[PDB]
Design a protein around this ligand. Structure first.
Ligand SMILES: O[C@@H]1[C@@H](O)[C@H](O[C@@H]2CO[C@@H](O)[C@H](O)[C@H]2O)OC[C@H]1O
Ligand SMILES: O[C@@H]1[C@@H](O)[C@H](O[C@@H]2CO[C@@H](O)[C@H](O)[C@H]2O)OC[C@H]1O
Ligand SMILES: [Ca+2]
Ligand SMILES: [Ca+2]
Ligand SMILES: [Ca+2]
Ligand SMILES: [Ca+2]
Ligand SMILES: [Ca+2]
Length: 358
């Protein structure tokens, strides 16, 4: 029987000279064992949902600050670094942003002059959303996910409502506005998943390089790192981090979780007791290799955040259920559903000096 997470050496202390160790949280998790584990193992937080655009401003001028405020207060009280997730996204974004003042959907507008006005209105709404949020939290946030998931998996820019209405201008204006109100001190990140996939890595690199060349203030790349036991390779992860470091950008691992399954997560286990020990062992072997790579690149990585605390709360449960007729669980962390350490904990808390790789 494994010890509980509050009985073992701190992850954040183990990596304190190398990078932050963070967790995504909900306000209701800021009590009990989850809070105890947070304060022991992590020195950085991010809001899993409470700071997304639809959570904060679900209707225009309706500001829903309570959940986000509780996360900020917890970070203040326990002296934790705080990432802000996220200022601009095509999901969990309220639809009122994209409706003109006559009630019509901007994406449907055919008149060229009205499309140009819609672009100005949407950009101004985004500017005011950013200004309001940054002005409230600027003294508590260290790293900002300014834009999230703007690159398409099929190549090129994601053709969300943001892109259809403004082109790339929403990206430039979002960073410019975050810098304007957060100051030069604020660290501004573009965040995405599958940044290890070479075609997507290259699209992101080319977008960021072009923006940097226009003076857009981008400080780093957020690698969501929603990964698997068999994918992506350490080699492709290394190549991605190094490509963005070559532009002078910081790298953060922002939403790390390692699913037991492939994509999509078909054939999921429906009970934690059904998970074979050798799968958790394969997961431990992979986390070992992953965190050794992070150690090798520690000069280029400021922070590594897991998208959750322990296996009893992870969006990967919902993904399993979406692809297995409503049932299924996933177990992606180093702490299991009972808060007991997993094989993976032991394989990332130890200290190795000779890092092997391909
Ligand atoms: O909506 C996004 C998902 O589509 C994304 O899912 C990824 C799709 O590409 C696959 O290769 C990945 O395995 C899978 O995780 O996750 C992020 C979410 O915001
Ligand atoms: O509770 C769920 C969240 O955990 C989930 O968080 C998103 C996962 O995909 C990533 O690509 C996003 O950046 C991240 O915000 O969003 C859905 C929600 O139901
Ligand atoms: Ca830091
Ligand atoms: Ca090792
Ligand atoms: Ca570092
Ligand atoms: Ca789970
Ligand atoms: Ca190790």
């Amino acid at each position: 029987d494994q010890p509980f997470a509050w009985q073992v050496a701190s992850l954040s202390e183990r990596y304190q000279e190398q990078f932050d160790i963070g967790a995504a949280v909900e306000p209701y998790q800021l009590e009990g064992r989850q809070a105890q584990i947070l304060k022991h193992h992590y020195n950085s937080l991010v809001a899993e949902n409470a700071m997304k655009p639809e959570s904060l401003q679900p209707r225009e001028g309706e500001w829903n600050w309570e959940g986000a405020d509780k996360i900020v207060e917890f970070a203040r009280k326990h002296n934790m670094e705080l990432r802000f997730h996220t200022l601009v996204w095509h999901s969990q974004v309220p639809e009122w942003f994209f409706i003109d003042e006559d009630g019509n959907r901007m994406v449907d507008e055919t008149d060229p002059d009205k499309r140009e006005a819609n672009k100005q209105l949407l950009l101004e709404r985004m500017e005011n959303h950013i200004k309001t949020v940054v002005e409230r939290y600027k003294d508590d946030v260290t790293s900002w996910d300014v834009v999230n998931e703007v690159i398409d998996d099929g190549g090129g820019l994601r053709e969300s409502e943001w892109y259809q209405i403004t082109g790339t201008d929403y990206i430039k204006v979002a960073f410019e506005t975050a810098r304007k109100y957060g100051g030069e001190e604020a660290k501004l990140y573009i965040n995405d998943y599958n940044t290890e996939v070479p075609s997507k890595r290259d699209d992101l690199y080319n977008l960021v390089k072009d923006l940097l060349e226009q003076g857009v203030p981008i400080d780093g790349v957020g690698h969501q790192s929603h990964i698997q036991i068999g994918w992506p390779s350490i080699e492709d992860t290394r190549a991605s981090f190094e490509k963005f470091t070559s532009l002078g950008l910081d790298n953060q691992v922002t939403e790390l979780d390692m699913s037991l399954y492939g994509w999509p997560p078909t054939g999921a286990y429906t009970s934690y007791d059904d998970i074979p020990a050798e799968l958790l062992q394969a997961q431990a072997d992979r986390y070992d290799q992953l965190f050794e790579l992070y150690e090798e690149l520690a000069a280029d990585i400021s922070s590594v955040t897991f998208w959750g605390i322990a296996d009893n709360h992870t969006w990967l449960d919902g993904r399993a259920r979406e692809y297995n007729n409503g049932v299924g669980i996933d177990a992606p962390f180093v702490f299991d559903h009972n808060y007991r350490v997993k094989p993976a904990y032991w394989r990332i808390i130890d200290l190795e000096h000779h890092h092997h790789h391909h």
